[PDB]
Amino acid sequence: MNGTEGPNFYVPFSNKTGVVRSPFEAPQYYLAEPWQFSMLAAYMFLLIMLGFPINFLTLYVTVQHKKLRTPLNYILLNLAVADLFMVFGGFTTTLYTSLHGYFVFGPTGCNLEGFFATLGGEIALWSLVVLAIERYVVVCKPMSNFRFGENHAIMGVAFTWVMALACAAPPLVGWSRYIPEGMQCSCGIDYYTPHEETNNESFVIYMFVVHFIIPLIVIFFCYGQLVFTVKEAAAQQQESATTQKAEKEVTRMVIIMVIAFLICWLPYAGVAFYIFTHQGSDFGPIFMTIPAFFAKTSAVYNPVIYIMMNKQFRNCMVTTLCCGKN
Amino acid sequence: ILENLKDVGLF
Ligand SMILES: *[C@@H]1O[C@H](CO)[C@@H](O[C@@H]2O[C@H](CO)[C@@H](O[C@@H]3O[C@H](CO)[C@@H](O)[C@H](O[C@H]4O[C@H](CO)[C@@H](O)[C@H](O)[C@@H]4O)[C@@H]3O)[C@H](O)[C@H]2NC(C)=O)[C@H](O)[C@H]1NC(C)=O
Ligand SMILES: OC[C@H]1O[C@H](O[C@H]2O[C@H](CO)[C@@H](O)[C@H](O)[C@H]2O)[C@H](O)[C@@H](O)[C@@H]1O
Ligand SMILES: *C/C=C(C)/C=C/C=C(C)/C=C/C1=C(C)CCCC1(C)C
Ligand SMILES: CCCCCCCCO[C@@H]1O[C@H](CO)[C@@H](O)[C@H](O)[C@H]1O
Ligand SMILES: CCCCCCCCO[C@@H]1O[C@H](CO)[C@@H](O)[C@H](O)[C@H]1O
Ligand SMILES: *C(=O)CCCCCCCCCCCCCCC
Ligand SMILES: *[C@@H]1O[C@H](CO)[C@@H](O)[C@H](O)[C@H]1NC(C)=O
Fold this sequence. Notes:
The structure holds two protein chains of two kinds. By secondary structure, chain A is mainly α.
């Protein structure tokens, strides 16, 4: 034995020496040194100091630059809101708790923080998907006489919020549950504990299939198509230097977007899969924090890729950051 | 492609 179970938590440390306390009641300095808790807090601090400005600016610059307010940008704004949910639901809370050494807000707080952090990360996830779809639709033109307009943009946004609730909401009402994770200072979805009363096993399969494999398939198909369309277009138009550049830039971007989606979610999926395949294993509190590190950091790198690296947003951001103009 | 690539912020 190497864990310690409680009514609604799973401390990844054996109580054979009797030192384990509830992660809702007292510091967990026995499953990690106090300094490592400070580094946890340091990391949440970084993600805020970088994460909030990047994502807030994205909304701000949109309020003040007409040209950004197009239907094809809605999903990107959406991405930025998702990131902020992660910032204020997840990151700030975790900065606060890590410095106490445990999840001082109790089980209900655990349900709130876990819900908003998950909602955030999930809306972001499905945004990145919807965006690949919209790009495929607009560029690959797989539908005769179709024009992407405001209404589709809205459906796309609504679709992400529905898919995200499809993930964050069940654990609030019986299908899986939220419980402190890693170092017990933040709450996630229980995907590593065989907990029958809530049906964790079927939920983990559902998550992996509907919320990882599907997204992965849809992204790969769409951007694969796009890279295909663009390679072909350029080959049939080699007299155009510009078209040759677009083909190269678009290919580079797709490699960055796909690799970036992997880095962000592969760890959660990889780890989840291993625990499912190797039922009951010694997994430490720090190692269980790794998948979170990869996902949560996307609140910074996603907007770098999808906003800062977007020519339009960038210019507007530079103009706004440099006072009047530049 | 070019206009569309601009619209979706990819070029
Ligand atoms: C990890 O292991 C430790 C050790 O097993 C465990 O901590 C222990 O929890 C029990 C209660 O579940 C504590 O027992 C109490 O001892 C104190 C003595 O001061 C009493 O206040 C408690 O009340 C008892 O006696 C009363 C008689 O007047 C009764 O009215 C009452 O119903 C109780 O019988 C109780 O005896 C024990 O002290 C701790 N031990 C340590 C070392 O902390 C811990 O809970 C485990 N961790 C997890 C997460 O489960
Ligand atoms: O030049 C941009 C004009 O439109 C802005 O707002 C638009 O944003 C969305 C269109 O995709 C819709 O929500 C809204 O109905 C549009 O009007 C801005 O409000 C206008 O003042 C600008 O002239
Ligand atoms: C602060 C931490 C957050 C927002 C973590 C969110 C994690 C998920 C929504 C995880 C999802 C998945 C699993 C639980 C396992 C299977 C694969 C995923 C990635 C869809
Ligand atoms: C965000 C919290 C992680 C801080 C990074 C340090 C973790 C890796 O560092 C090692 O981890 C072990 C933990 O059991 C310790 O026993 C070692 O002393 C420590 O060097
Ligand atoms: C960014 C805002 C910082 C929040 C202040 C965190 C206060 C931590 O509170 C600490 O919790 C300890 C448990 O480890 C207690 O022993 C002490 O009461 C206290 O010093
Ligand atoms: C309009 O033209 C005036 C804005 C020019 C500001 C230039 C100053 C750069 C400040 C960078 C901030 C880095 C500090 C990060 C804190 C850790
Ligand atoms: C827990 O602890 C040990 C590591 O010392 C591990 O090898 C073992 O497989 C784990 N046991 C259970 C029952 O999960």
